[PDB]
Design an enzyme around this catalytic site. Structure first.
Site, PDB file in Angstrom:
ATOM      1  N   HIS A  56     -88.900   2.740 -51.653  1.00 30.67           N
ATOM      2  CA  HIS A  56     -88.799   3.789 -50.635  1.00 30.67           C
ATOM      3  C   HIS A  56     -90.046   4.696 -50.613  1.00 30.67           C
ATOM      4  O   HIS A  56     -90.502   5.056 -49.535  1.00 30.67           O
ATOM      5  CB  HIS A  56     -87.520   4.591 -50.848  1.00 30.67           C
ATOM      6  CG  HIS A  56     -87.231   5.566 -49.755  1.00 30.67           C
ATOM      7  ND1 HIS A  56     -87.301   6.892 -49.947  1.00 30.67           N
ATOM      8  CD2 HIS A  56     -86.880   5.373 -48.430  1.00 30.67           C
ATOM      9  CE1 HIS A  56     -86.959   7.521 -48.801  1.00 30.67           C
ATOM     10  NE2 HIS A  56     -86.678   6.597 -47.886  1.00 30.67           N
ATOM     11  N   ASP A  57     -90.573   5.053 -51.799  1.00 32.27           N
ATOM     12  CA  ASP A  57     -91.830   5.851 -51.931  1.00 32.27           C
ATOM     13  C   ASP A  57     -93.039   5.036 -51.338  1.00 32.27           C
ATOM     14  O   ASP A  57     -93.890   5.626 -50.633  1.00 32.27           O
ATOM     15  CB  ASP A  57     -92.181   6.181 -53.396  1.00 32.27           C
ATOM     16  CG  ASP A  57     -91.137   7.013 -54.114  1.00 32.27           C
ATOM     17  OD1 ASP A  57     -90.309   7.685 -53.489  1.00 32.27           O
ATOM     18  OD2 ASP A  57     -91.131   6.969 -55.363  1.00 32.27           O
TER      19      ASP A  57
END
Length: 120
Positions: A56-57
């Site tokens: 997600h990052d």
């Protein structure tokens, strides 16, 4: 292409292969840094949410460094995060009826949180 490789790695790559690409920083041109689950524990109730957070990052950091961190792209990245989290939760059998159901309920909360606050 920085965008075709980001999307391949984000949406069409199983987690082990994404972590391998990460560990090797391959391809070197993109942002491989992370703050894990951006303070919410990495292992809530002992479930591994860190790999999903790492991806997600990757999606947030690379879409921001790229031209395209829009609200509609942010949601595609958030939805892929609930997908990744649900993949991890599905590793409880069968038996951990239980772990899988609890893991999914916390995954929903992590997902709700990124939907609400991720624009920051």
């Amino acid at each position: 292409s920085p965008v075709s490789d980001t999307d391949r790695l984000l949406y069409s790559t199983a987690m082990p292969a994404f972590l391998t690409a990460k560990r090797n920083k391959n391809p070197g041109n993109l942002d491989w840094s992370d703050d894990g689950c951006s303070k919410s524990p990495d292992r809530p109730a002992g479930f591994n949410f860190l790999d999903s957070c790492k991806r997600h990052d990757f999606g947030y950091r690379n879409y921001k460094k790229q031209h395209r961190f829009t609200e509609a792209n942010r949601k595609r990245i958030d939805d892929n995060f609930k997908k990744d989290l649900y993949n991890e939760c599905a590793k409880y059998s069968g038996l951990e009826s239980w772990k899988g159901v609890a893991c999914r309920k916390i995954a929903n909360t992590y997902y709700d949180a990124v939907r609400t606050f991720g624009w920051l």
